[PDB]
A paper describes a structure:
Crystallization trials using purified TSLPΔ127–131:TSLPRN47Q:IL-7Rα complex lead to optimized crystals that diffracted synchrotron X-rays to 2.55 Å resolution, and enabled determination of the crystal structure of the human TSLP:TSLPR:IL-7Rα complex by molecular replacement. Our crystallographic analysis contributes structural insights at high-resolution of human TSLP and TSLPR and reveals how TSLP wedges between TSLPR and IL-7Rα to mediate a T-shaped extracellular assembly, as further supported by small-angle X-ray scattering. TSLP employs two opposing surface patches to interact with the elbow tips of the cytokine-binding homology regions (CHRs) of TSLPR (site I) and IL-7Rα (site II), which allow the membrane-proximal parts of the two receptors to engage in heterotypic receptor–receptor interactions (site III). TSLP and TSLPR display pronounced electrostatic complementarity spanning the entire site I, with TSLP presenting a positively charged surface patch associating with the negatively charged interdomain elbow of TSLPR. In particular, TSLP employs the C-terminal half of αD (residues 142–152), the C-terminal short tail extending from αD (residues 153–158) and a continuous stretch of 10 residues located in the long overhand AB-loop region (residues 60–69) to interact with a complementary interaction epitope formed at the elbow tip of the CHR-module of TSLPR. Human TSLPR uses three regions to grasp TSLP and buries ∼1,900 Å2 of solvent exposed surface area: (1) the intersheet EF1 loop and N-terminal residues of the F strand of TSLPRD1 (residues 91–96), (2) the C-terminal residues of TSLPRD1 strand G and the interdomain linker connecting TSLPRD1 and TSLPRD2 (residues 110–116) and (3) the α-helical turn located in the FG2 loop of TSLPRD2 (residues 192–195). TSLPR-Asp92 pairs via a bifurcated hydrogen-bond with TSLP-Arg153 and TSLP-Arg150, while Trp112 packs between αD and the AB loop of TSLP.
Thymic stromal lymphopoietin (TSLP), is an interleukin-2 (IL-2) family cytokine produced in response to pathogenic stimuli by skin keratinocytes and epithelial cells in the lung and gut. It regulates immunity at barrier surfaces by driving the activation of immature dendritic cells (DCs), mast cells, basophils, eosinophils and lymphocytes into a type 2 polarizing phenotype34. TSLP initiates intracellular signalling by establishing a complex with its specific receptor, TSLPR (encoded by CRLF2) and IL-7Rα. Consistent with annotations of human TSLP as a member of the IL-2 family of cytokines, its mature sequence (residues 29–159) adopts a four-helix bundle with ‘up-up-down-down' topology stabilized by three disulfide bridges (Cys34-Cys110, Cys69-Cys75 and Cys90-Cys137), in which the four α-helices—designated αA, αB, αC, αD—are threaded via a BC loop and two long overhand AB and CD loop regions, with the latter largely invisible in the electron density maps.
Residue numbers in the entry:
A (entry chain B): 37 to 232
B (entry chain A): 28 to 115, 134 to 159
C (entry chain C): 29 to 218
Write the structure that this text describes.
């Protein structure tokens, strides 16, 4: 199968949105293949994707965001494979940023805060955040916390002492938009105090 | 003429909350919401879609046509997909304000009326 | 000249109040209806201020309609307006607020209202916090995990109407009584 996956980003640059598609098999011949989106568009039937390295990209204000569109892989005029998708159900948020952790001497905790551009957007303005932390030494002993706000607090007594911890955060759409997890924010590292 | 009685209201409601609501607010940007006199009412969801249909697409006096607006293009698209057998002094801001109230009333079908 | 305020108290009572220094030491009348094809009825419940009419109370009986009204200097209308009543909705203050603690978590519940599309918001803080932190839900059952049993927290609850349904000009309810909690027990000050 010449299967692929897609993701949309609404208001990624101003009031224009983006549609990105890429094949599930990385070792495929792209010299002859071109993508086409048809349906749920503004005053046009179809729009062509730009072949950029190993991905197919669109950027426009002409996405209607009502009903399903038809994304097809084309070899000239003939369509090899076709996929019917609603662009409001494949949304991938912009990743969070300005992640930071501050130890509060009296409180004996760590206030974790971050930011997201989606707070200043009209459409995809409601997200669910996923903050993941661990001891940098461990392998897959990551601790995940879901939240709707951009502030979280970790207790000193509920963490290991004199240990380097790593923390990162990502977001998924919520409230009448469905889709995928964003990319992770850059990680932030912090050492906890010793038992004194 | 057309009965909006067999529509997928829940799908239409999702379309409103996603982007149509926001497109109506962007059209009304710069106006004080409390300043508008609300005159057009609706009861149940079929009746609200009847009144939304008329105000969005039927050309009135004071407002030539809202059909080229993004909110109208999406409204036309939502009704064609989810309503089976659906056939398709600049007082425009006042009229879009009337639409906003019907759309909102379409989201409150459990509240009683006289 | 005429300044007006509208409040729809808990989907029960509409209160329209007016101010107009021209028509002071004078009793202006209030006339209303809920449809554009019916005759206007007169106010049967007047508010006064400085001995003269200043407002009207209508029992709206949980109804979602456009209120059409006019204030008159006898027969002569001084002010005319029409509005969806629920645009000025003020939900009631949370009642029967209860807290259940489990280690470093709390679940705050209260009596839900009879009407939907509301947000039941819980605000909280300890002496280490510079502002109130918040969590809200569609029903009055909000769970706040990741707190500290060892700290004192001040809490209070309120009800808001959702902007997508009721529009942007509603009022949040009044906040409920403030309660202080350390190690799953109630306290006096914080
Ligand atoms: C207005 O009504 C109040 C209450 O009945 C009365 O005391 C007052 O005399 C009235 N004012 C006028 C202008 O007659
Ligand atoms: C709060 O909701 C959760 C899940 O919806 C449930 O476990 C809990 O019993 C609820 N509390 C009350 C008092 O309804």
């Amino acid at each position: 199968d010449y299967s692929f996956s897609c993701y949309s980003q609404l208001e990624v640059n101003g009031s224009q949105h983006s549609l990105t598609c890429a094949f599930e098999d990385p070792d495929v011949n792209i010299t002859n293949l071109e993508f086409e989106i048809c349906g749920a568009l503004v005053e046009v039937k179809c729009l062509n994707f730009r072949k950029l390295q190993e991905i197919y990209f669109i950027e426009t204000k002409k996405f209607l965001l009502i009903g399903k569109s038809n994304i097809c892989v084309k070899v000239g005029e003939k369509s090899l494979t076709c996929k019917k998708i609603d662009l409001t159900t494949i949304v991938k948020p912009e990743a969070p940023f300005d992640l930071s952790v501050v130890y509060r001497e009296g409180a004996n905790d760590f206030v974790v805060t971050f930011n997201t551009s989606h707070l200043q957007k009209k459409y995809v303005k409601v997200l669910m955040h996923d903050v993941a932390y661990r001891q940098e030494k461990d392998e897959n002993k990551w601790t995940h916390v879901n939240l709707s706000s951009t502030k979280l607090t970790l207790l000193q007594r509920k963490l290991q002492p004199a240990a380097m911890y790593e923390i990162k955060v990502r977001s998924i759409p919520d409230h009448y938009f469905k889709g995928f997890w964003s990319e992770w924010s850059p990680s932030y590292y912090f050492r906890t105090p010793e038992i004194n | 003429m057309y009965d909006f009685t067999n529509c997928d209201f829940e799908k239409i409601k999702a379309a409103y909350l996603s982007t149509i609501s926001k497109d109506l607010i962007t059209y009304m940007s710069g106006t004080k919401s409390t300043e508008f006199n609300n005159t057009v009412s609706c009861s149940n969801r079929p009746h609200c879609l009847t009144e939304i249909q008329s105000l969005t697409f039927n050309p009135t006096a004071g407002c030539a046509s809202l059909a080229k607006e993004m909110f109208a293009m999406k409204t036309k698209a939502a009704l064609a997909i989810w309503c089976p057998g659906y056939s398709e002094t600049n007082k425009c801001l006042e009229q879009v304000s009337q639409l906003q109230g019907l759309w909102r009333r379409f989201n409150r079908p459990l509240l009683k009326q006289q | 000249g005429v300044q007006i305020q509208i409040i729809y108290f808990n989907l029960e009572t509409v209160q329209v109040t007016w101010q107009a220094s021209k028509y002071s030491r004078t009793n202006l009348t209030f006339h209303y209806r809920f449809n554009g094809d019916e005759a206007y009825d007169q106010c049967t419940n007047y508010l006064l201020q400085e001995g003269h009419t200043s407002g009207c109370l209508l029992d709206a009986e949980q109804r979602d309609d456009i209120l059409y009204f006019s204030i008159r200097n006898g027969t002569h209308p001084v002010f005319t307006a029409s509005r969806w009543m629920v645009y000025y909705l003020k939900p009631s203050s949370p009642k029967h607020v209860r807290f259940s603690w489990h280690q470093d978590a709390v679940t705050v519940t209260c009596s839900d209202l009879s009407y939907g599309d509301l947000l039941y918001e819980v605000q909280y803080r300890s002496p280490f916090d510079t502002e109130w932190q918040s969590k809200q839900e569609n029903t009055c059952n909000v769970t706040i995990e990741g707190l500290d049993a060892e700290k004192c927290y001040s809490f209070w609850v309120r009800v808001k109407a959702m902007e997508d349904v009721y529009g942007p000009d509603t009022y949040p309810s009044d906040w409920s009584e403030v309660t202080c909690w350390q190690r799953g027990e109630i306290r006096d000050a914080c």
